[PDB]
Structure formats: C-alpha cells, structure tokens
Design a protein around this nucleic acid. Sequence first.
RNA 1: AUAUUGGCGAGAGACCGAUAGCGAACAAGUACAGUGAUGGAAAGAUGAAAAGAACUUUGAAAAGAGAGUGAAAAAGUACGUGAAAUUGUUGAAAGGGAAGGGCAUUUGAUCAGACAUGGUGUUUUGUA
RNA 2: ACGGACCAAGGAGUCUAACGUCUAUGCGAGUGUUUGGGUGUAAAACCCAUACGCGUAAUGAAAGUGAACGUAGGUUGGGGC
Lengths: 185, 126, 127, 148, 51, 49, 52
Amino acid sequence: GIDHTSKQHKRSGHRTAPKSDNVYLKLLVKLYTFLARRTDAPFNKVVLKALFLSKINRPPVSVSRIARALKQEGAANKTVVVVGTVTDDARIFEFPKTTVAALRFTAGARAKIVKAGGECITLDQLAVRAPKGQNTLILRGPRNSREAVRHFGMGPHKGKAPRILSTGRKFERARGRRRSKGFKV
Amino acid sequence: AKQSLDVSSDRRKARKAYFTAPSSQRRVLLSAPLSKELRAQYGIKALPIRRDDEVLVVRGSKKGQEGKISSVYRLKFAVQVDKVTKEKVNGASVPINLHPSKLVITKLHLDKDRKALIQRKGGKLE
Amino acid sequence: ASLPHPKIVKKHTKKFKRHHSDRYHRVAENWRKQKGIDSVVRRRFRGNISQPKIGYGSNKKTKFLSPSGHKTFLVANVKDLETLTMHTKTYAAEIAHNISAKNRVVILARAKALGIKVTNPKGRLAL
Amino acid sequence: PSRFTKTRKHRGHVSAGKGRIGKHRKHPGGRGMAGGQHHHRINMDKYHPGYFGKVGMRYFHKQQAHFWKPVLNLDKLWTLIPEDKRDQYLKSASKETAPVIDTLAAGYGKILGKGRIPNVPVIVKARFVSKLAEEKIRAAGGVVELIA
Amino acid sequence: SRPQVTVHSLTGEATANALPLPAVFSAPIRPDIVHTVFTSVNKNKRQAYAV
Amino acid sequence: AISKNLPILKNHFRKHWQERVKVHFDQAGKKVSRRNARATRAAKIAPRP
Amino acid sequence: QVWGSETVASSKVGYTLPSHIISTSDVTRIINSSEIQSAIRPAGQATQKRTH
RNA sequence: AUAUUGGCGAGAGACCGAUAGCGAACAAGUACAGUGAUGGAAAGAUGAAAAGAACUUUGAAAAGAGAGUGAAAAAGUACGUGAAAUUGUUGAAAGGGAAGGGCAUUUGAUCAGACAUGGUGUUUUGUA
RNA sequence: ACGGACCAAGGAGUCUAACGUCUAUGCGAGUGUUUGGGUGUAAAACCCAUACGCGUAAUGAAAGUGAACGUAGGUUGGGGC
C-alpha cells in the first residue's frame, strides 16, 4: 500500500498531439519532431511546443512589431520566425528588405513585405536553410490583450472587467459605483 | 424521368387510385398486348381486353393454354376463360381469373368504337 | 499449420452472467453493472459472483485466435477469398449464415486450392 | 448532436449527474434575478456591483443621430487612398498637392490622436478634431477644412 | 513548366494538343474541412416535421 | 437563480409565445412567385418596364 | 478564368485562391534533401535493445 | 407586397409505423356509460388462386382417424411466422423444515481442435 | 423502513432563442451570401449590389472632452539566438 505523495496518472498539462485535423499540419509536425531527436538544438523543441498551441496561444503577429526587431541589435540582416499567421499593419510606412519564415501570411501582409523588397518563405523552406536555428529571431502575439483575459480575476477593489452586452449608465453604475449610493466598490 | 409538377411518384396514391378505381378507367387498367401476327396487320401494340376476344397464356402454371373469354372481372381486375378452368373436390367446376398483361391477343373483335381506336392509335387495320 | 504462437491461456473460462439472472425471468445473461449503493456483489464481498474487469486482458500474440490458432475472417464472395494470399497461417476462413449452399462450396473449393482452413464445412450439406 | 452528449453516459448511473441529496429541482433558489436585494446579493456585491440604485437622469425620446460620431485617428488617414495613389502622394512630398481627404465620405465625424505619421502636407475636410491632432498637422504642413 | 494534359476525341484517342493547367490542382487539399462542411450542406437540402 | 460570473440575461419569453412564431420555409418559395408576378406584370402590363 | 490564378484575378470579388503552408506532397523528400542529411548526427536501432 | 393549425385541389418529407401515428388505416365521434350538459372505445395481415374440409366410417351434434385439396396445412374461416408468463407430455435429474448462488473437482450427457506435419533414399506404381 | 404477484411492448436532463468556458476553421482591422436581386440541373446549387450589427477608444450625471518628451522610457527576471 504505497502512499502517493502527490497524484495519480497526472498528465503533464501539455499536448502530445495537436487538437487539430489539418492534413498539412500532420506533415509539418512530423518533420519538426525528426529534428528534436537528432540535432540537440533548443530551437526545434520550443517550435514543437507551438504546434500544439491554440489560436489563443497563437495570436496574430503583426509586421509593425517585426519592424521594431529590425531596428534592434542583431536583426538588421536577420530572418524572422512566426508562430501562426502574419497580419498586415496598416499603421507603419517604412520598411527594408529581410526574410520572413512564418506559417501563414495574410494577403495584406504578404503584399507590403514582398512589395517593400522583402520575402515571405514558409517554415519548411527556411528550416532547410537554418537546421539548428542559425540567424533566427522568433516573436510572440498579444495573449493578455484579449477580450476574455480582461474578465479574468474579477473581485472587489480589483477591476477585471464586468460582463454585459450594453455599456453606459444604468448598467452597473448605481449602488456600489459611487461614494453616495452606499459605497464605491 | 420526372420534370413536370403535375405527376406523382408516390406509391400510396398509386395503390389508392388502383384499389379504388372506377369501371370506366378499369378497362384501361386492364390492357393487353397483341401478337407479332396482329402487330403486322395493324401495327399497334396495346388494347384493353373484352368478352369476345381469343387470348393465349404465355405465363404461369398455364404455360401454353388459350381460350375464349367468358366474363372479365374488373371488380378484382381479372378475367374468366371457358377453355382454361379449374375443377373442385365437390365436383363443381369454376373458371379461372387472371391478369391480361401475361395474356397476348391472337384474335380481336371490331365494332364502331373499335375501328375508330385503331386509326386513333396509329394503325392500318383491315 | 499455424504461425509462431505459444501456449494459449484465457484465465477465466466460465461465463460472466448478470446479477439475479438465475432468480428472475426479467433478468438476462448479459453483464449489466449494478449501480445499487447496497450492492454486495459490487462491494466485492465473499460469497457473490465475480465481476468482469479490465484485469482479464490477453497477450497480443495469442489474442482473437480460434481453437486452431487463426484469427477469423468473414467472407461473402470468392473475391475477398483471394485477399488472403500471405495471410493463410495468420487467418482462418469462414462463410456467412445468410449465404446459399451452392455458391459457398465454389468458394470452399477455391479456398482449399490456396491453403486456408474453413471452420464450417458442414454448412447446409444435403446427403 | 445527442451522440456527443454525456447524458447518454448517465443512462445507467440513475441520478443523471444531478446529485442524490438535494438532487435536481424545479427552480431551487428562484426564477431569474429574484433575490438580488435579498438572499442573492452575495453574488451581486461582487461580479455585478451597481445593478440596483440610480445613475444620473432620464432622457425622453433619445435619438442616436446627434450621437453619430465615428472617430478616425492619426493612425489611419492614408488608408483612405488606394495604394496606387497612396505611395504616389507619399514618396514625393511636394507642395500644393496636399491630398484632400473627406472624412464625411468615409463615414466619420470626429478626428483624434493615436500614433504619428510622416512629414507630408495633407488637407482634410472633417467635422470635429482634437488638440493633439491639431498640433501635428500644423507641424506637418497641411490644413483642415470646416464641414457641416 | 506546366504538367500538360492530352486532348481526347469522341472515339477515344489522344490528340497532339497538349495544354497547361489551371494550377488549382497543385493547391491545398483538406478532407477534414469537407467532413464538417458536408454535414452542413446536407441540412440545406432538407425539410421539416412536427406533431 | 443568481449564479456564476456571466452577463445578466434579458430574454423576454414569459408568455404563451408558443402560438406566436413565424415559419420561414416559404422564403424560397415566395422568391419564385415573387419573380412570377414580375414576369406576369411585364407580360400583362404591356411591354412596359 | 472563373477561378483566377497567379496572373489573372479570379472573376470573384474579394476572392483569391487558398494559401499554401507546405512545399512538397512527399515529406520523405523534404526530410531527405542534402543539407539535412548533413546537419543530422548518427541514427539509432529502430527497435531498442532491452538492456537487463 | 404582410397572415392563415378551417374548406377545397396537388406535389413532397433524413416524420411515424397497429399500446404507433389523428379518438379514428376497419359498420368511428360509431359501440357503449350518464337525468343531462358531456365523455368516449377494442379492432390491419388465411391463401398466388377459397382453389374454404367433397367423400368413407364412428358419433346425438361438434368432430376423430384418414382421404382429398393445396408449391407449402410446421399455410385450415378461433387462419402469416407465433416472445415471455402459464401449461400438456415424454426424456433427465435433485430434494431429512426453502430454493437458487461464488470458487475447486467427481460423475452423466455433450462438443471443438489436433492428428496429416514439411521432407529425403525410392522394389519402380492405378492413367503429367 | 417504503414500493415491488408474473411476463412483454412503450417509458422520463429536450428543442430552440440569447450568451459565457474550451476547441477547430476561414478571413483579418475588417468580417457576416441564404434581408433582398440574378440564375436554375430546381425548396437545392452558384454569383452580386447596397446598407447594417459587432470590432477597430475610452471617459463622465451631463454640456463636454479624449492616449508618443524620450529609437513608444527605465529597473528586476527572463525563452531563443
């Protein structure tokens, strides 16, 4: 009668497989696991973790944050890495050349990048040109900038967005919203 | 196939119109084919059965038995023949009723309305 | 004439009947789990029947093998009969119960010309 | 579909995932919002603070016509010109060619300040504006037109 | 460099007319999107019933 | 009744609205006779638009 | 013409052929290559030796 | 141009299927109960064709044994096949105030597979 | 302690409106064809105009106003390179 100090058959809390059915994703994941085996490089390991992420964990990476990376140390002539799709930031104006190795490129994004003089290569083509991740620069998306993440952790004195379709007064701005009507939260 | 909105493919409306058919449209529901002999004297292929007709059986347990019709039973959708009957155990003999689709016509009986239908269907008669 | 397999053991050989299947006309032989809170059989007591559990699984090297040592294969025609080329020592042939005595023997003779075993040669033999 | 519902996996457990003590009842604590000022203000104080009471005043017959004010910031602006004419008036920043932009035609009302643009003179016909946007417009070289 | 396809006549036979391809054939093939969307279009050509 | 952290519901269904519903199966059927009134107007109401 | 391509539009408004994410149909061809057959260290047994 | 669970005339349904679906697939709002206002059923299927039991004998009749009919009465107006409860009967077995049960084996009855394998020297064999 | 003489047929966490959690999918600062028109192999299918909801900004009771000093700052910890 062994006393298990913790818990039984507790799963790591990770995905051993993608919760997706994409035929091309079954192909993509297969080649990146081949690398996490016989190269040792920490590159193919963190990228293999992104193959099991959701759209919430794979937020759209904009080309404006990508333009910020070129103006920094080391990425002047380096290729960029994207987990998911690439969206076109109609908020920027100037941009150089460089290379992009993302999963997807939106029509708008793929246009201004290649039109400014740059290139839009898929994960697999740049994977052959950089086996262990030589000259790479990977970035993330705004996860805690979602509508849902706002309504997470709601309690008195905190301020974590209340749920309701309608905004404005008469909508939770009465008793418990002003020092006059009893109190203000 | 089905292209018109006025035609139904429903099996119930067929076995309803058939099981509750009137005698006038009953002579229609009981039409019979002619022989190659009659298909060459007129050229027509169909024509409902009547009392004064001689028809040959080419199907059933009466394979090869012809006769002259006694009285057609539209009620059950059949027809009795005096030369093709069945005997009983009490000694009484009662004729047999069958379907005219298995009975090909060899001899026909023409009248006023009969010769009019020959030309109306596309024939040459005699 | 079978493939490399050891001594086939099945553990529990007797039947797994339901509770009260020997007490009522309403109860069948099929195993139904008892959800009663005062279920003595469910509480694994001494004197009650043994409940079927996962702990009775078989080795994958002798599993599904018939009395001879061949995993069954159901056929309806001579075309699915030919599909057992390199599967003659691995599988044993058998006909369906809704077939006719005549077409089945044309397939039984075709099966012997190949080297497969038929576990039902007495199917509708009129002598 | 009824297939993927676990209710089918309760077709033996008897209770059907609703307990054995308090079980499943009609309307246990009540129907809807009943109990807010009463027995259910615990969940109201937190989560929904301010549902009861009074705000400011009443507006009789309110029409969202006087309230139609979609805003546009410094952020966009160039988005209102096709790329084939956008970079034509971009690269070559000359004078008296100041691209006249109609906010009225784009479905807008007021303008504001979000996050900079280049130093090219641009003329725009807008209704209202902001103090910050007003400043980076004089410094850029363009003017504003008063539309009604 | 188009893959090319040979033209056929009414009596079979291949014609000397080799032509290029639309390129939608060298595009993505997703049998899983079809699975879900197929169950949706089947419900489009339906009717109703009540008591 | 009052439970969890969710947006308060304002669904007005406390009536016998089981007798007040609209079936839109004739939607596509009306579109056909919609066109049959136009082809009949252009036909009955002379060669005028 | 009705579906467009790489040179023509697509005839449809706001429409453009689906985006690709891969390169080859056969992945044993990509994984094979020449640059890959070099940056990869020695292999294994394919069926582990049961030590002890 | 908007409506429509009544009437009338048509075409359909990922509807339902004789304790269903309409109360109602039939002499059905009929039988039948109630002072009455009202309430409100059970019931589809023989057989391809009644081709429906002629006829002998025993019997008061019903019928019996047969025969005949019939492709099939293990298809007969109490009719397609005919589930369980209950029952007839022969065969089996147990039983000193319950029956029946778990696990092991005795005995009764009963049943599957395995056997040939594969193959070598070969007096040389019914007709390769 | 309560129902349970027996056997069979039926027999109970549903549909749909409005949302939340998680998930896949397409597009992407836009998005939604089936509101409507065209066409027709016909309640299907395929294509389209114009608006609109939601999002792309909040803040106050309201008039009213409304996000770059700084390579969109510094510090501590930081994957990868």
